[PDB]
Amino acid sequence: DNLFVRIDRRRKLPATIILRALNYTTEQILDLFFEKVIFEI
Amino acid sequence: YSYTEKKRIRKDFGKRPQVLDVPYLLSIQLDSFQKFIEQDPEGQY
Amino acid sequence: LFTNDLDHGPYISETLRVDPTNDRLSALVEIYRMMRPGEPPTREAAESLFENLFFSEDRYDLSAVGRMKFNRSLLREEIEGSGILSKDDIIDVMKKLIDIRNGKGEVDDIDHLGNRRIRSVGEMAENQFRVGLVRVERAVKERL
Numbered sequence: 001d002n003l004f005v006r007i008d009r010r011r012k013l014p015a016t017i018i019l020r021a022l023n024y025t026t027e028q029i030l031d032l033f034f035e036k037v038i039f040e041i
Numbered sequence: 042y043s044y045t046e047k048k049r050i051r052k053d054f055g056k057r058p059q060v061l062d063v064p065y066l067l068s069i070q071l072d073s074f075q076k077f078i079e080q081d082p083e084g085q086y
Numbered sequence: 087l088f089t090n091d092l093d094h095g096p097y098i099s100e101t102l103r104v105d106p107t108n109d110r111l112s113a114l115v116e117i118y119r120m121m122r123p124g125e126p127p128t129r130e131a132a133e134s135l136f137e138n139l140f141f142s143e144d145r146y147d148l149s150a151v152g153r154m155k156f157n158r159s160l161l162r163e164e165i166e167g168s169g170i171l172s173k174d175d176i177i178d179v180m181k182k183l184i185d186i187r188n189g190k191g192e193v194d195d196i197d198h199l200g201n202r203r204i205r206s207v208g209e210m211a212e213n214q215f216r217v218g219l220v221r222v223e224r225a226v227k228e229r230l
Contacts, residue, residue, distance in 0.1 A: 001187075002101040003180065007139070013120055015180065016098070016105040020113035021136060022173045026102060032177065033098045033184070034087040069206060077208030085150075086212075 093188055140171045151203065159194075 003015035019029050042050070076086050089096050107113040111129075118132035119125050121139075138145050148156060148169040157165055160178045185191050194201060 001095055001097050002104060003097060003183075007117075007121070011120060013116070014101055014105045014107075016101050017107050017113045017116055018176065020105075020107050020110055021117060022176075023110055029098065029102070030087060033181070036087060073206035073208035075208075077211055086208075 095188065097184060097187065143170060146170060 004012045005015045005018050006012055016029065024032075087099070088094060089099075107116055114132045114136055115127055117136055118128070121135065140146055146169075148171070150166075150169075153167050153169060154165045156175065157163075157167065160175075160182055162178075182191070186193065
């Protein structure tokens with residue numbers, strides 16, 4: 001269970017690369033595609 | 042009754058009231074070509 | 087973050103773990119490697135290629151019916167817009183694909199008449215005429 005991107009049906013490529021190309025950071029990606037919880041001690 | 046039909050009337054056995062007339066059978070091609078060649082101020086087509 | 091096995095999933099986190107790129111430039115050069123069988127590690131040509139691939143009006147075009155269908159498919163209420171893909175469009179596409187993966191939604195019907203369209207003589211003639219105009223403009227610019 002992971003996502004790929006294929007442009008013009010050429011060859012497989014991971015789907016995170018297209019997000020990276022649009023000046024997106026890893027933590028921004030995780031904020032976009034996940035929901036957060038708070039842990040406190 | 043029209044002049045052409047009055048010379049020979051075809052007996053109709055249909056029993057349901059005609060409500061919508063059969064449209065002009067060649068509308069698609071002419072409408073497409075008119076949309077192609079007609080002046081368009083909005084410039085959509 | 088939040089993870090499950092029935093309603094949610096680590097679809098993107100695992101992709102990131104398998105993802106070899108680290109920054110924007112590495113992703114751009116990897117895309118350039120994939121597109122071009124030759125692999126020169128340049129700087130500006132890769133960015134230009136990526137920009138013209140999807141964000142250039144002269145090379146990419148979502149028609150009015152295309153934009154309307156795109157907006158209706160992603161439940162977006164507004165029907166009009168631009169013929170150029172945005173980043174929000176891609177984000178919504180992947181979000182909806184994940185939602186389908188999560189069991190929330192269903193796939194489209196290929197043979198539904200709401201997914202197939204009629205193209206008549208005028209549209210094809212217009213396409214051919216535009217092709218001719220595009221062929222003319224190059225020589226026009228060259229000699230200008």
